[PDB]
Scaffold this active site. Sequence first.
Site, short mmCIF file in Angstrom:
data_model
loop_
_atom_site.label_atom_id
_atom_site.label_comp_id
_atom_site.label_asym_id
_atom_site.label_seq_id
_atom_site.Cartn_x
_atom_site.Cartn_y
_atom_site.Cartn_z
N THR A 254 0.87 -1.19 0.00
CA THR A 254 0.00 0.00 0.00
C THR A 254 0.90 1.23 0.00
OG1 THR A 254 0.02 -0.32 2.36
CG2 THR A 254 -1.88 -1.05 1.22
N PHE A 379 -7.73 5.24 3.84
CA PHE A 379 -7.34 4.44 4.99
C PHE A 379 -8.52 3.70 5.63
CE2 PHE A 379 -2.99 5.29 4.93
CZ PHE A 379 -2.81 6.60 4.47
N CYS A 386 -7.11 2.09 8.99
CA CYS A 386 -5.73 1.63 8.99
C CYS A 386 -5.02 2.12 10.24
CB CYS A 386 -4.96 2.28 7.79
SG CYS A 386 -3.27 1.72 7.62
C1 HEM Z 1 -0.72 4.37 2.16
C2 HEM Z 1 -0.54 3.18 2.79
C3 HEM Z 1 -1.73 2.40 3.37
C4 HEM Z 1 -2.99 2.34 2.99
C5 HEM Z 1 -3.66 3.04 1.78
C6 HEM Z 1 -3.70 1.48 3.92
C7 HEM Z 1 -5.04 1.12 3.77
C8 HEM Z 1 -5.75 0.38 4.66
C9 HEM Z 1 -7.16 0.17 4.65
C10 HEM Z 1 -8.12 0.67 3.54
C11 HEM Z 1 -7.48 -0.60 5.70
C12 HEM Z 1 -8.90 -1.07 6.10
C13 HEM Z 1 -9.07 -2.53 5.57
C14 HEM Z 1 -10.51 -3.06 5.65
O1 HEM Z 1 -11.46 -2.30 5.95
O2 HEM Z 1 -10.76 -4.31 5.39
C15 HEM Z 1 -6.25 -0.87 6.41
C16 HEM Z 1 -6.12 -1.53 7.61
C17 HEM Z 1 -4.95 -1.81 8.31
N1 HEM Z 1 -3.70 -1.42 7.97
FE1 HEM Z 1 -3.28 -0.10 6.41
N2 HEM Z 1 -2.81 0.94 4.82
C18 HEM Z 1 -1.59 1.57 4.53
C19 HEM Z 1 -0.40 1.41 5.17
C20 HEM Z 1 -0.30 0.57 6.30
C21 HEM Z 1 0.87 0.43 7.08
C22 HEM Z 1 2.25 1.10 6.75
C23 HEM Z 1 0.59 -0.44 8.05
C24 HEM Z 1 1.48 -1.00 9.14
C25 HEM Z 1 2.59 -0.41 9.58
C26 HEM Z 1 -0.80 -0.81 7.93
C27 HEM Z 1 -1.46 -1.67 8.79
C28 HEM Z 1 -2.80 -1.91 8.85
C29 HEM Z 1 -3.49 -2.73 9.80
C30 HEM Z 1 -2.83 -3.51 10.95
C31 HEM Z 1 -4.89 -2.65 9.46
C32 HEM Z 1 -6.02 -3.34 10.24
C33 HEM Z 1 -6.46 -2.29 11.33
C34 HEM Z 1 -7.61 -2.82 12.17
O3 HEM Z 1 -8.62 -3.25 11.55
O4 HEM Z 1 -7.47 -2.86 13.43
N3 HEM Z 1 -1.33 -0.17 6.87
N4 HEM Z 1 -5.21 -0.25 5.74
#
Ligand code: HEM
EC number: 1.14.14.1
Length: 441
Positions: A254, A379, A386
């Site tokens: 991502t 996000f 996220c």
């Molecule tokens: C621009 C970069 C990123 C984007 C666009 C992004 C996007 C997203 C999105 C859309 C979700 C929601 C997923 C869902 O609803 O099924 C998500 C969840 C999550 N992301 Fe990101 N992400 C990014 C970078 C990162 C980074 C760098 C990390 C870790 C260091 C990360 C860790 C997580 C985690 C652990 C979740 C689950 C959170 C929860 O439901 O408790 N993401 N991300």
Amino acid sequence: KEMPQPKTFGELKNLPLLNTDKPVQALMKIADELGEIFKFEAPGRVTRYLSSQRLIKEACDESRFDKNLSQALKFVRDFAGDGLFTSWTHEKNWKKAHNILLPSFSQQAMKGYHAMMVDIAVQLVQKWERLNADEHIEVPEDMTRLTLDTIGLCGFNYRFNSFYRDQPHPFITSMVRALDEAMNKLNKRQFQEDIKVMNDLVDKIIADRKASGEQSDDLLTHMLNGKDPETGEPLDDENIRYQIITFLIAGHETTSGLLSFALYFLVKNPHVLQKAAEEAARVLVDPVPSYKQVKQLKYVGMVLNEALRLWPTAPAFSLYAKEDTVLGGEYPLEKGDELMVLIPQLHRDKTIWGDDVEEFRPERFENPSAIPQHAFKPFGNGQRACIGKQFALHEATLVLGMMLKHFDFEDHTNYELDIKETLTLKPEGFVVKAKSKKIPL
Ligand code: HEM
């Protein structure tokens, strides 16, 4: 009140429509044709694809809808476990890990990850400084070496040393192979082996750390030390392993895709690149950027948000109805019915953004509190948004800022955008040449 639906194929329903290399981009054309909501059915399944802010704001109401584990996420779970990304909100370990980790992902927490972020960013800039005249840069490839290594160092103080290699560290190979196998499912022997290569390394490092007792500035130390305020329990070693795998999986591509799309849009819009480069040059006055300097890179921030507007690199997320309810006064849903939010389409809702939606104009984020609630969701949503958002934006603002300070860029191939789809989006084959400004680093 009757919901549009695209072509069906007998018992196969709409499924053949995503039997294609670029399903989200196919789904956007269908949105273009059918509008703000359509039904989409496979043999197992029904979902409804949502594209308008009007409907998505309702879908984002957490009293009415919660995160669904899509098929993709259940396939990812075979190696991501009950880490945060692949857990139901009602699973005990989702809430425990969420409560424990949230403050370790705050904007304040970025101060403690900043030095290791800089460590890898400097490795990236130094690789490019060291290219000869006759060389160019493979952008998503180098961005992914950066983001893997940064998440490795900040997550568990481990160096994949991706800039010392042509063939990645074997953890990365297995992780990347594992993710592709999980996505291709929408082989078995290799999947189990790759799962094992991942758990073994990550289990070892956790076991080593508990042995030595060392305290570092990484997420692993915070997790070994955390206690959930509610239950008073720590995360157990297995779950901690799943969280580390999860940060890598959810965060590597991502974020590298964001840095890639951002550089793409900048080389395609030189006036915008120049304005960003002028900021970078005015703000980043030290050979090593400070945490405070990265926060002062406002227009770079706007650049990244505009890149996220056009190509949110995790482009769709899934929801289910908690109770029977009516969407947008028109569409009756039953308890458990699924919604999909098509974020690229949301981000092109002309009624929010104006008619110029395909244009790359970072000035649209000048005043971020102008933007209406739920209009901009790269996000995700609410408590299932996220957790990595501040880490991702700090990383990308830092690295893009450095790139723009240290080099001029040439789109020497007049690159034509080709968006590869996996769990995530990226401009496949994007290449540039970078000519050093020869500024100390
Ligand atoms: C621009 C970069 C990123 C984007 C666009 C992004 C996007 C997203 C999105 C859309 C979700 C929601 C997923 C869902 O609803 O099924 C998500 C969840 C999550 N992301 Fe990101 N992400 C990014 C970078 C990162 C980074 C760098 C990390 C870790 C260091 C990360 C860790 C997580 C985690 C652990 C979740 C689950 C959170 C929860 O439901 O408790 N993401 N991300």
